[PDB]
Short mmCIF file of C-alpha atoms and ligand atoms in Angstrom, two decimals:
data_model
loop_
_atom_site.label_atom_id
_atom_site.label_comp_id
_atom_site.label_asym_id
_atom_site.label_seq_id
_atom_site.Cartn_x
_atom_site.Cartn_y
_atom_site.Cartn_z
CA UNK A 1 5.21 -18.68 -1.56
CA UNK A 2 5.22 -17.32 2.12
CA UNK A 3 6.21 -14.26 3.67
CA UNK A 4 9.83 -14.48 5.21
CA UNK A 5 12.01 -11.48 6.77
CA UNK A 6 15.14 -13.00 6.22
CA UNK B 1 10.09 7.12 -26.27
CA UNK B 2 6.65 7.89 -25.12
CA UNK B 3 7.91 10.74 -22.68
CA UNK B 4 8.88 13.66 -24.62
CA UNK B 5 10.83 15.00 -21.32
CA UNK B 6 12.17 13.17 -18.09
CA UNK B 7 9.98 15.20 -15.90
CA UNK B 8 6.80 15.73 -13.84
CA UNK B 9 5.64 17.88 -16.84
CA UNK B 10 6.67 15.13 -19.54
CA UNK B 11 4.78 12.48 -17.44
CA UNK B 12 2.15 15.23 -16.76
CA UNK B 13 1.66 15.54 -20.89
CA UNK B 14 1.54 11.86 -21.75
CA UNK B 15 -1.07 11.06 -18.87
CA UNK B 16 -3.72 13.51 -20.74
CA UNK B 17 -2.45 12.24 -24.00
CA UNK B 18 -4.80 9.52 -25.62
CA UNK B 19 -1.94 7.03 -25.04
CA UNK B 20 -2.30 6.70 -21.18
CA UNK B 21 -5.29 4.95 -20.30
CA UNK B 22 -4.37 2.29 -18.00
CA UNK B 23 -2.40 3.40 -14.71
CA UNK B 24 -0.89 1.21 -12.48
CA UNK B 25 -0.08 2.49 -8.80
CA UNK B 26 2.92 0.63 -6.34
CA UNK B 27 2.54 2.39 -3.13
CA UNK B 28 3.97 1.69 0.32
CA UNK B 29 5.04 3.43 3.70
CA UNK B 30 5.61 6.54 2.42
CA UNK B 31 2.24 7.26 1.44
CA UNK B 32 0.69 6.86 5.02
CA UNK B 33 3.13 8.27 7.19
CA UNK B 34 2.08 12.24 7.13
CA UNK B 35 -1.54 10.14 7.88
CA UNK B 36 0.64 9.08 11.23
CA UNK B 37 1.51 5.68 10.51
CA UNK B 38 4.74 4.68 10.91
CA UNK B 39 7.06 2.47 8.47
CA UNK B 40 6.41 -0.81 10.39
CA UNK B 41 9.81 -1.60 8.10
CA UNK B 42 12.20 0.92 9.33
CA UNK B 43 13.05 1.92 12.87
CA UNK B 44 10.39 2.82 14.73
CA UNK B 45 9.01 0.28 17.59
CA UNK B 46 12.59 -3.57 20.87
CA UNK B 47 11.10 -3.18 23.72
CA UNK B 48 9.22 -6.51 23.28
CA UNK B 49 10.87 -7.64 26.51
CA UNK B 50 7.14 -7.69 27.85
CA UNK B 51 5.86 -10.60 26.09
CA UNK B 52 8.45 -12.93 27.18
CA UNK B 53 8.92 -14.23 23.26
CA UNK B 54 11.45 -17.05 22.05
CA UNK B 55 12.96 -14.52 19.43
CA UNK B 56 12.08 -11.07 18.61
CA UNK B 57 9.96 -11.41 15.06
CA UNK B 58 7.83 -14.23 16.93
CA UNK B 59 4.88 -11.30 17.70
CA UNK B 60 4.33 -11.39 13.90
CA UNK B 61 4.62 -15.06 12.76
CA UNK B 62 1.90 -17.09 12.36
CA UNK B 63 2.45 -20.15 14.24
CA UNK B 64 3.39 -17.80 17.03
CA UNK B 65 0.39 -16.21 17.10
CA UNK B 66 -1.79 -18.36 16.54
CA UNK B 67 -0.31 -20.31 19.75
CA UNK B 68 -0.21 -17.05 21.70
CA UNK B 69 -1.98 -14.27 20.15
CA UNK B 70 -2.06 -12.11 23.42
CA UNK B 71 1.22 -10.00 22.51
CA UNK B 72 0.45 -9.14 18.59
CA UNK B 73 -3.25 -7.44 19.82
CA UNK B 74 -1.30 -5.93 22.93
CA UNK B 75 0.94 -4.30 20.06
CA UNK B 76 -2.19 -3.64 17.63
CA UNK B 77 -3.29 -1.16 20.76
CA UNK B 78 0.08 0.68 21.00
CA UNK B 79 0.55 0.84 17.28
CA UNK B 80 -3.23 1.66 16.39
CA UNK B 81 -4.29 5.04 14.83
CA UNK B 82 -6.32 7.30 16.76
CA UNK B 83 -7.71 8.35 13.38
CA UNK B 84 -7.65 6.91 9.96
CA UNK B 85 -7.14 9.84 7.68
CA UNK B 86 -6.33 9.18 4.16
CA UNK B 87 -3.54 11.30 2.76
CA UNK B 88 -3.55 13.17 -0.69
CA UNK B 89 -1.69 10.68 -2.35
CA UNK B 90 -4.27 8.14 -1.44
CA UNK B 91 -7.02 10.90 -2.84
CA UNK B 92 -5.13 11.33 -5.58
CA UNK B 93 -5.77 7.60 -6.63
CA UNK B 94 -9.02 8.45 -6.13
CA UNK B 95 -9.06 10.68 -8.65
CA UNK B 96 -6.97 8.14 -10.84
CA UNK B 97 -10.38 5.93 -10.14
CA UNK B 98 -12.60 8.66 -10.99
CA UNK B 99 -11.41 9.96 -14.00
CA UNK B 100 -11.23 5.93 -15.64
CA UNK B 101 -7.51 5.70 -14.96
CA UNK B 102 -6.79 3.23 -12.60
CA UNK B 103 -5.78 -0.24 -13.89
CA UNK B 104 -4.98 -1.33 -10.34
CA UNK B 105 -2.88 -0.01 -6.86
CA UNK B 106 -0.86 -2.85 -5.21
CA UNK B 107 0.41 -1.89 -2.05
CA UNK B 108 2.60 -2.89 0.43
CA UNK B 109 0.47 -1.70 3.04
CA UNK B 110 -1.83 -2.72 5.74
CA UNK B 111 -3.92 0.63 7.43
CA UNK B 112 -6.77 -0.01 4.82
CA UNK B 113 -6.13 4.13 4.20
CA UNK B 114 -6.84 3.09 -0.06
CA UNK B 115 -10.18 1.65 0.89
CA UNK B 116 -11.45 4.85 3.00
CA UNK B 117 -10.08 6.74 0.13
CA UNK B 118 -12.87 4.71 -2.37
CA UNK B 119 -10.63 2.70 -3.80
CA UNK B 120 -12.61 -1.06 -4.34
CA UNK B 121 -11.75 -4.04 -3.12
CA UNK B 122 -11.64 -4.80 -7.08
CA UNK B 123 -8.94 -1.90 -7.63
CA UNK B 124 -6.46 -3.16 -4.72
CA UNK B 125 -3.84 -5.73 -4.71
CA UNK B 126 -2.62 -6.16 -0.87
CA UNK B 127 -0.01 -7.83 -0.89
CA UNK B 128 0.61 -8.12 2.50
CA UNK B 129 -2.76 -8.13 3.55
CA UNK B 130 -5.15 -5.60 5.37
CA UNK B 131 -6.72 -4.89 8.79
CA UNK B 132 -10.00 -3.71 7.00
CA UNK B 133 -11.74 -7.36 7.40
CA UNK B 134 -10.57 -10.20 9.35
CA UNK B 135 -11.77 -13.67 9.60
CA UNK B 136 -12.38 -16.50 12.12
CA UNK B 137 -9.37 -19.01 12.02
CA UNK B 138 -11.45 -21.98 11.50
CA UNK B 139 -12.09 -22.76 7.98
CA UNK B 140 -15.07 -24.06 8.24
CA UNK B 141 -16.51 -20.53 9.66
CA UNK B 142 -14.47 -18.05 8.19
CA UNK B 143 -16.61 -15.53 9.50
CA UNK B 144 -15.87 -11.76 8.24
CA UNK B 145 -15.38 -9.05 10.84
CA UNK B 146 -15.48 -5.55 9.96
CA UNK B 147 -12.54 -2.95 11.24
CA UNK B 148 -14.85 -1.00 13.86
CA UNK B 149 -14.81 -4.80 15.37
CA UNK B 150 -11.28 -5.48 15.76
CA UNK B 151 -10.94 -1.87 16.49
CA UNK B 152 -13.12 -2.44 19.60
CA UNK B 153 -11.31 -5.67 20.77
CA UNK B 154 -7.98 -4.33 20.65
CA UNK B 155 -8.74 -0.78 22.64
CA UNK B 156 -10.88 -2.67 25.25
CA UNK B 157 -7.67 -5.52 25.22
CA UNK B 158 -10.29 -8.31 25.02
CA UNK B 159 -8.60 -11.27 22.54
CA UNK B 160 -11.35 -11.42 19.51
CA UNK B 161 -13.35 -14.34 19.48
CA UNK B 162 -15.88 -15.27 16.40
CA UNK B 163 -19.60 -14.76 17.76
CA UNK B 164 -20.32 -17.82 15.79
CA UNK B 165 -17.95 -20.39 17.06
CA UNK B 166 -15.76 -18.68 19.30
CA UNK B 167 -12.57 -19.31 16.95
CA UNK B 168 -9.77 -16.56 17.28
CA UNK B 169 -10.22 -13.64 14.44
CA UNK B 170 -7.29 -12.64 12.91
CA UNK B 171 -6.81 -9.39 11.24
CA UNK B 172 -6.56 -10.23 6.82
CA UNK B 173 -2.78 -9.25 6.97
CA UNK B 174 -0.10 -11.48 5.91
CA UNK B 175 1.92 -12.60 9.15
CA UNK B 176 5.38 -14.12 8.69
CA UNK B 177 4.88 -17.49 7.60
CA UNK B 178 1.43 -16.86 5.67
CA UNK B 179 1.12 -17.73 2.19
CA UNK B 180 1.64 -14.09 -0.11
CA UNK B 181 -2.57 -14.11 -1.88
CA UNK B 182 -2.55 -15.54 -4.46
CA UNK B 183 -4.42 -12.28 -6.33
CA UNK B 184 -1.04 -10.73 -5.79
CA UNK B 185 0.90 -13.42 -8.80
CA UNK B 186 -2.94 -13.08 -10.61
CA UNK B 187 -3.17 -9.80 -10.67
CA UNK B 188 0.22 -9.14 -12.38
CA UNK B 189 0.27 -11.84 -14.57
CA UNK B 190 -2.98 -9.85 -16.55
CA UNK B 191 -2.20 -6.32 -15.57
CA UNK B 192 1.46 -5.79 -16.30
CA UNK B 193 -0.04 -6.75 -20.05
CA UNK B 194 -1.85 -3.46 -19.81
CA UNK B 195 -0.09 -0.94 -18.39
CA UNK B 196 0.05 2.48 -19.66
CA UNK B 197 1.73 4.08 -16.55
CA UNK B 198 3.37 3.15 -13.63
CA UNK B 199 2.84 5.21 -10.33
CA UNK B 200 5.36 4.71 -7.97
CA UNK B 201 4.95 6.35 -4.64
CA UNK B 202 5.83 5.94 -0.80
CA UNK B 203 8.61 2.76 -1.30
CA UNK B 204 11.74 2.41 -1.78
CA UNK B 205 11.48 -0.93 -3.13
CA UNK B 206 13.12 -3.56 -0.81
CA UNK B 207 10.22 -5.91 0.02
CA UNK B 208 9.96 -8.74 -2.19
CA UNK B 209 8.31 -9.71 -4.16
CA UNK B 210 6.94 -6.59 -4.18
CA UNK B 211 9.57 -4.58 -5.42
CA UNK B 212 10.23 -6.93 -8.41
CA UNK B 213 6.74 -5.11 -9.94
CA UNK B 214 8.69 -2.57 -11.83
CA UNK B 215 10.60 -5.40 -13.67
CA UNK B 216 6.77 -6.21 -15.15
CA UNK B 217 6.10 -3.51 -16.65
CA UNK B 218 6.47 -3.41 -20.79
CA UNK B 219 9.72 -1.31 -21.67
CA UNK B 220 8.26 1.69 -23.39
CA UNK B 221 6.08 1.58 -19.70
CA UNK B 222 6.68 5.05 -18.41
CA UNK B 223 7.13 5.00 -14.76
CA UNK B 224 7.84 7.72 -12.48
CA UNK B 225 8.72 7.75 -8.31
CA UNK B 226 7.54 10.12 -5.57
CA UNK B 227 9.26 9.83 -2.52
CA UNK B 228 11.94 10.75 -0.26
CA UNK B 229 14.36 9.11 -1.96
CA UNK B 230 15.46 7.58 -5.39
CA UNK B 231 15.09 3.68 -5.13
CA UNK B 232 14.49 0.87 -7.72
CA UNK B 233 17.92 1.05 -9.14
CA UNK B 234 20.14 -2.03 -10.14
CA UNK B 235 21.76 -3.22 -7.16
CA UNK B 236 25.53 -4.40 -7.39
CA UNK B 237 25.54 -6.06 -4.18
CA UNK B 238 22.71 -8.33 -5.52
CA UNK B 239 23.84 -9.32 -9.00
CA UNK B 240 24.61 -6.12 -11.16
CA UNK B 241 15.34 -7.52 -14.21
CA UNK B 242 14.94 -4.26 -15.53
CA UNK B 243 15.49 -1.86 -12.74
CA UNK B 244 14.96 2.19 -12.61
CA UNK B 245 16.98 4.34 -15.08
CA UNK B 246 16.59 7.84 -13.83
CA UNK B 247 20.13 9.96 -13.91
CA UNK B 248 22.41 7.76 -17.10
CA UNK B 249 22.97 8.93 -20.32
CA UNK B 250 20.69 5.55 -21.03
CA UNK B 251 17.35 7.14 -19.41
CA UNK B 252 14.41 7.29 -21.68
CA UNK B 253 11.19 6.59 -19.19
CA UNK B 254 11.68 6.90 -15.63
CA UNK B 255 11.38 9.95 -13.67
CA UNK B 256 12.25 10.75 -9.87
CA UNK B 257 10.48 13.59 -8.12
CA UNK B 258 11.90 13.93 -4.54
CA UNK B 259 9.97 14.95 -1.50
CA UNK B 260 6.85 14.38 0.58
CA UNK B 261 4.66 12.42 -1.58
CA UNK B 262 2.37 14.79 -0.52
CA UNK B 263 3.75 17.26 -2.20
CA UNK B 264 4.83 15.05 -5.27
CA UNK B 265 1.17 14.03 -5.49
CA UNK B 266 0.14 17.91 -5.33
CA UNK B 267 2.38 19.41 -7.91
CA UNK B 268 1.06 16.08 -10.54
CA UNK B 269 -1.81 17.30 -9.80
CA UNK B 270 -1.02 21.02 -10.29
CA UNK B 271 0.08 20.03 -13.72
CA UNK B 272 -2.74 17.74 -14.20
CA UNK B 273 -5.57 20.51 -13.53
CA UNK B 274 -6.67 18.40 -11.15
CA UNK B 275 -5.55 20.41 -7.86
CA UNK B 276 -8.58 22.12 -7.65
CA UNK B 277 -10.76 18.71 -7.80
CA UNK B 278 -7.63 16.86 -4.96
CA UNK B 279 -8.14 19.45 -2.52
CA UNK B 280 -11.82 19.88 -2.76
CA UNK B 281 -11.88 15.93 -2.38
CA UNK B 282 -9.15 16.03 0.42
CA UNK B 283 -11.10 18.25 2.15
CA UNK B 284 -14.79 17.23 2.11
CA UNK B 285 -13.46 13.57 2.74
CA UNK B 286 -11.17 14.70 5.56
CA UNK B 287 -14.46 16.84 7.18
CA UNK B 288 -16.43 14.04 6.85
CA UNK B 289 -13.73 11.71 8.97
CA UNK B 290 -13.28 13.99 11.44
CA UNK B 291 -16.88 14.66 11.74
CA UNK B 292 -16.99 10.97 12.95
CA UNK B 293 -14.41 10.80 14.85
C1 MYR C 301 3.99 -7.84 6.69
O1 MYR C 301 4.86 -7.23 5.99
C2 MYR C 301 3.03 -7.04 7.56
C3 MYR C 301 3.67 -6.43 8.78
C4 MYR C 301 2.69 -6.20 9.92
C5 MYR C 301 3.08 -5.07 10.86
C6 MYR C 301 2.45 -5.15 12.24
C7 MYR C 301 0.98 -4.77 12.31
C8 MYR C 301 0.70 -3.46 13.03
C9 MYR C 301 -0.61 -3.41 13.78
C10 MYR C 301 -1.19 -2.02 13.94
C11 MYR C 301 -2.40 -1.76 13.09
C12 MYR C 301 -2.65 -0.31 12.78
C13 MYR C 301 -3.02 -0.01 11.34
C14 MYR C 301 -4.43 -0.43 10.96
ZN1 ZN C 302 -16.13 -18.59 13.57
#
């Protein structure tokens, strides 16, 4: 998976 | 239940008991910030209206940056340490290291602090990366850089280029939009098999999928907190996945010891026998840093 704030 | 007491002393006991060989450390934020290095997850920082960006969180996306990597280095040199000094709690994994303890530290953060500490490369999950290498952005070079050599590029506000091939060199942090490592889902699919102890200091759990760590470990796994503030909890306003029992009439493994981890670190240690061996360590290591600048 990938890094994501929201 | 494999504490006898819901304390620092209870934990204290079972970690010199024969049962507790294999320690696993979660650390974040909280564990570098008397080293001055701020919570890039809280408030600190905004005024970003200098880089003329399409939305704020642009200066740490990949795509971004990789199109305009001017603003994120311009950043690096406001937000970069005039010193990395390594903080008891990171010498106090040290120790863990030292003494055969230390399954593994995963942690949230990016100053490479564990590594000057002596933790391995082999001990460490970073799960959001780290600035202590960085690599060329083509693929086919890959070449490694060494901190000192971003350090220079960013203080003399030159972009970094790869010797080699001229590439950009990005720092080995996760950016928004970057893959998580894949060592991170590795790591705890073998470790969380082993764990003895669980070390939680410095976060307050809200990263994922960080956070959802403490849900790994085995049930009898007792796991205790330093830091500022209780965390880890169930959360109603999520759903209602094991999460930290501390303060209900339920509790059997975790403890919460509230305060500086600093001083968390140095009163496990106190109870350990160890604070003798933490603050000669602290000390030599911290001499020898400042002796080089
Ligand atoms: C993803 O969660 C990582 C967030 C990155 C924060 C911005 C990087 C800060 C640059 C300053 C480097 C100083 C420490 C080595
Ligand atoms: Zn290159």
């Amino acid at each position: 998976p990938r890094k994501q704030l929201a | 239940r494999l504490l006898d007491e819901l304390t620092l002393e209870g934990v204290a006991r079972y970690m010199q008991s024969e049962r507790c060989r294999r320690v696993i450390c979660l650390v974040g934020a909280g564990i570098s910030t008397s080293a001055g290095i701020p919570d890039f997850r809280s408030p600190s920082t905004d005024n970003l209206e200098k880089y003329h960006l399409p939305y704020p969180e642009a200066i740490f996306e990949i795509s971004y940056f990789k199109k305009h990597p001017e603003p994120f280095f311009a950043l690096a040199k406001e937000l970069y340490p005039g010193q990395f000094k390594p903080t008891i709690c990171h010498y106090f994994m040290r120790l863990l290291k030292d003494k055969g303890l230390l399954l593994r530290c995963y942690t949230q953060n990016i100053d490479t602090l564990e590594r000057i500490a002596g933790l391995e490369q082999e001990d460490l999950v970073e799960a959001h990366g780290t600035f202590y290498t960085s690599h060329c952005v083509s693929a086919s070079c890959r070449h490694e850089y060494p901190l000192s050599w971003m350090k220079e590029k960013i203080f003399s506000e030159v972009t970094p280029k790869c010797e080699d091939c001229q590439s950009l060199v990005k720092p080995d942090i996760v950016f928004f939009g970057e893959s998580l490592p894949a060592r991170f889902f590795s790591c705890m699919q073998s470790d969380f098999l082993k764990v003895d102890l669980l070390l939680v200091m410095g976060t307050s759990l809200q990263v994922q999928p960080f956070a959802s760590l403490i849900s790994k470990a085995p049930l009898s796994t007792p796991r205790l907190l330093i830091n500022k503030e209780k965390a880890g909890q169930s959360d109603p306003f999520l759903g209602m996945g094991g999460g930290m029992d501390f303060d209900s009439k339920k509790a059997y493994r975790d403890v919460a010891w509230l305060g500086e981890c600093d001083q968390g670190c140095l009163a496990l240690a106190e109870l350990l026998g160890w604070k003798k061996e933490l603050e000669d360590l602290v000390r030599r290591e911290h001499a020898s840093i400042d002796a080089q600048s």
